[PDB]
Design a binder for these strands. Sequence first.
DNA 1: TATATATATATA
DNA 2: TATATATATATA
DNA 3: TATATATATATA
DNA 4: TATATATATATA
DNA 5: TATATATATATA
DNA 6: TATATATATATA
DNA 7: TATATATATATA
DNA 8: TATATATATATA
DNA 9: TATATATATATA
DNA 10: TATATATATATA
Lengths: 199, 199, 199, 153, 153, 153, 153
Amino acid sequence: GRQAHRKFDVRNDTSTRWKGKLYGIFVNYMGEDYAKEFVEQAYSNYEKVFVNIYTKIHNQLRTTLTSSAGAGATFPLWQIINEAIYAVYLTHKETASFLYAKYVARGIQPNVVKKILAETGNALKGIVPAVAQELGETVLDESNVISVVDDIVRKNPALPNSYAGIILQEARISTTPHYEGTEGFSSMESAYSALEEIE
Amino acid sequence: GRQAHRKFDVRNDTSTRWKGKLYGIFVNYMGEDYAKEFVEQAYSNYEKVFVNIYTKIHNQLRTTLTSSAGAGATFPLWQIINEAIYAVYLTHKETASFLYAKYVARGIQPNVVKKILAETGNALKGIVPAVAQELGETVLDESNVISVVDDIVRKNPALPNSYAGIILQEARISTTPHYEGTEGFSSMESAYSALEEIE
Amino acid sequence: GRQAHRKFDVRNDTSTRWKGKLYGIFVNYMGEDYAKEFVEQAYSNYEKVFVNIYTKIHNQLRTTLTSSAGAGATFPLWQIINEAIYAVYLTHKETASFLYAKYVARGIQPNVVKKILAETGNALKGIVPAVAQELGETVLDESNVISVVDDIVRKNPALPNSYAGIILQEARISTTPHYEGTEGFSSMESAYSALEEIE
Amino acid sequence: RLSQASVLRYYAKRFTMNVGTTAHVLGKEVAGNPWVAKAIDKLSYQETYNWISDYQASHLAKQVAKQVAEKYGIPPTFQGLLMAYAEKVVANYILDYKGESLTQMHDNYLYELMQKMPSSGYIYVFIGKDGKTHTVDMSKVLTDIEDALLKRA
Amino acid sequence: RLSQASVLRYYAKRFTMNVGTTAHVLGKEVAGNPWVAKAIDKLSYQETYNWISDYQASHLAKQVAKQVAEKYGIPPTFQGLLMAYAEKVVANYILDYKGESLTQMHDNYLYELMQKMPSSGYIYVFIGKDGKTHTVDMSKVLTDIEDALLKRA
Amino acid sequence: RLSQASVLRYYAKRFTMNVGTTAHVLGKEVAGNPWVAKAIDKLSYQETYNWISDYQASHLAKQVAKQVAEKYGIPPTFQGLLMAYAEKVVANYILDYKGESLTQMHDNYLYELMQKMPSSGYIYVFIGKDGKTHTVDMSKVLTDIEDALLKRA
Amino acid sequence: RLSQASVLRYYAKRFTMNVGTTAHVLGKEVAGNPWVAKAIDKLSYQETYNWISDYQASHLAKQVAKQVAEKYGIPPTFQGLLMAYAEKVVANYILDYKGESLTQMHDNYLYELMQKMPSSGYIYVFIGKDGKTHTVDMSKVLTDIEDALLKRA
DNA sequence: TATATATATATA
DNA sequence: TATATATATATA
DNA sequence: TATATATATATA
DNA sequence: TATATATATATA
DNA sequence: TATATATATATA
DNA sequence: TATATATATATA
DNA sequence: TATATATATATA
DNA sequence: TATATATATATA
DNA sequence: TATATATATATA
DNA sequence: TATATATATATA
């Protein structure tokens, strides 16, 4: 017993693992040149969508989650921060009241759900530009989240699944942290990457 | 009889042995370029986690261990300094009283266990910054270790296994021994490495 | 005296014994090709009906039978679990009160009969889907079995013998244990079969 | 529709990706030996068995949807969106019961079938083959499809 | 779930890493010869035999956990965390007896299932399919699972 | 433990280092020809034969150690250090007799198993599965293992 | 029951297994020649002679059991279990005398006919054709069957 | 009991 | 060869 | 004893 | 072909 | 969940 | 290969 | 123990 | 490929 | 002996 | 790949 303790996370090499394994599988499928070219475009979309949104949200919410309902079994709750991104925001498919009514049945008491669903929006608005103007200039809190967030979904009906997908970021304007005047103020990893690259 | 006397330790070339063998195995798996790139990131995590913590702790504890229960069979005890790092600190999964009750059954008398579990924390606090503030400004001793160290685990419940993993060192601040004013005062090996490198 | 001790059971090779003997007999009857093809369809029905119902019921009831009236002569009683399947359930030909009145005359005291006839339904409802909804959401017990099970037979008159036969399972819906979410949770023999098959 | 050929067609195309994953960057060298062909053949047969053996629920729900849809003279275009409930209900509700009640799901997908006037967006108007115009409401036809599926099950 | 295909699927994927370790930086050259294919085939068969032959204990503990979990109307989400004890106990306690007693381990994992209010974090509330709300305590269901596993063993 | 697969696993990994030493800086060129594969195959088979054929003494001493260790309720951790004498004695003493007597070797390894108090370091205390505490002395269990091995031989 | 046809039916089916053992993997080639048919015919006749000639003891014990069983109005179901003693006694006791006494065997099989209440498990209750209920004890009917068999012998 | 080999007692 | 209720004599 | 080839004595 | 108690004559 | 490999249910 | 709603079995 | 190669038990 | 609790068999 | 290539006997 | 006690077969 007690063979090991596996850990699952984004570890600065997932890109190469994914690319290599899917190149090994498809090399027989199409030929060497096409297979080598294809995986780059295949991985670029995944990098643009999953990494830039879900990773940041999870990394933001880890601390408050461990503080709130920290235990071994945060598993039933881990899917809430993932579900709120897709169904409620970016598609407007499900009302927040409906999700609150649904997910209580699994047994988690209301206060934590109210805190999480509200805390997600605050972080999400900063990340995705399109959400901000639709949400407007307001501050979400568990006192009024169930009243406010579902207002938009009531006003606007179920959006198609395209908006969750590739059409997400291309048509909207913003500024990278490089500029000089925006909030931004770029992270340091862009320096370690260069330092590695120099040799 | 008496073929040889194998010795197992970190011997300034483990890096290249590991990299070479795992490159030889995976060269067929993915192709040359990906295989060559992958093992660097594969080994960097191991270097950052195992070498910077467990090696230092073991090298600190070797002398007092040989003094305390020095014999051929320090094997049953060698796993205690390894277990205390993972279960009690950095995850808070097991109370110190529970470990003391458990591990006596294998037959080691209490005094050595009390000395080791307390001595580990003193060295560990200096190494990992995150432990220090949670432990606070106190001095551990076998007189009060069983009373004090389990206080934190009582206060804070079982942390997830992520904290033992990659999330460990990146978000916390410190200073390398290079600076000029911290404790530090860098070791000499960084000179022999350069002297080798020059040719 | 004491030549041997024959045992009769389903022993993982009955299929091939049956197929081979009945192929040997019919090879003269029709010709080689038809004889080879025929026994497959001949045995498929037997496998679908006998194996999937009666074998499971008997294997479930063996332990409680040996506990209840365990002896060498469980022979007079062994036919009850077989009779209850056909006459009462799946055909509604005989009222449970009639069977209880009939079969006591052979001398078995009532309590065991009441326990067996009730215990059979609990296992049978899970196996055959069609029985479940007709029986409804109830729990059978010897306290009320003689009152409840015969209610259906009173309501619905004698069904034809077709329902006991081939029309049994094809028109009703269910899920194999493969799915992921049903009760199920498939047995392990499907692994030993593959392991044998690989060579 | 699927008939006879569909099982074979699904079977055939597993071979390439399966021989790819068995031997990763060694296709020409490995695939030559007959043994590996035997093994990869034998493996690719069980995947179709799992697929076809475990797909009956969806096909029977799809079956029940059709005759009910036809009785209202529903034109072909909306038949697929009606086909939605068939497995939207024979998967989430009856087999495993994810944590929802029926009525709220009924409301949810109806929140996907709306009109958007600013007409009867819950009662469409249709033209038949004979030119007789008649109308159907989504609410009642949906109620009919779930209770019919439940009785069928 | 595993059935039939799972053994084959585990068998197939050992070939690449095994032919890698047999000949390290010589794949194209070595793998061409039929003999090495025969040997590496023959070797990769015994590893699955050891895996499947020595996995029954876990599967039977997993089997016993399910029916007990179902009888309380436990929803799917917590069933895995209940599945924990199955092999947390049929490995450390009964087969080899690492140096612990049962009650302290029972307390330990319960120190992983808590609530954190500053509710009954040891008695959750659940909603059934019929809308009947009922509650279960973790302590008694755990006691039932260990003594049931012990009697089963 | 070793069973079936272990012999094959030892066989497979000799190929790389053997083809290395046959042709030193010519791997790609030489290994292509089938003949050298035949010869290096044929050679790497006898080394496993020598290993497995000449390892029985150690395995049987290891066998004898286990049942004696179990009868005192020795926990797993010390079983290896008890396993020491098995081949510390079936190699130096009985097969070839290096120039020592038994008692001094018995004293020597006991000079490796001590306690270091400044407890009964020759009589440890152990906790059983039922909670019954009982003690064993190393001296007598060692005497039992050597005379049992001698009678077995 | 056996009559006339039974001897022929046993005779017919020996032919296949006998021609199998005469010529093992040569059926088509060997069986063509008439001579082997003559010999295997002639052999398969003596086996039935040994069977029927040496079966009379069992049949006569079976004969004696019936009329005694009938006189108590025993229903058909238990008649076979009563038939047990017939040859349980005309084989082990009187022909060859395996090393047992009678009373202990009487106790042994009665240890196979019990009830298990936690009723008169040695005196069953029976319903006759006329509705007159009457009871019989196994002990006395068994005593009657052995002493009747002994006098008959 | 279920599998299928042949014969009787009224209309498909 | 099917569509229903009972048969007795044979293959497993 | 256990493996399976055939026959007798009552109902599945 | 199963579900139980004893049979005798044959294949290993 | 997002990435892309194949099968069903109506028109581009 | 796209334009929408749900599927089940496979590669990571 | 930490590194990553494959299989099971519920939803992202 | 991630987000959590335990698994058994393999590469170092 | 010391250098490192592979297999067995318990937990890091 | 480490942290301890002994193994047998191979590279120098």
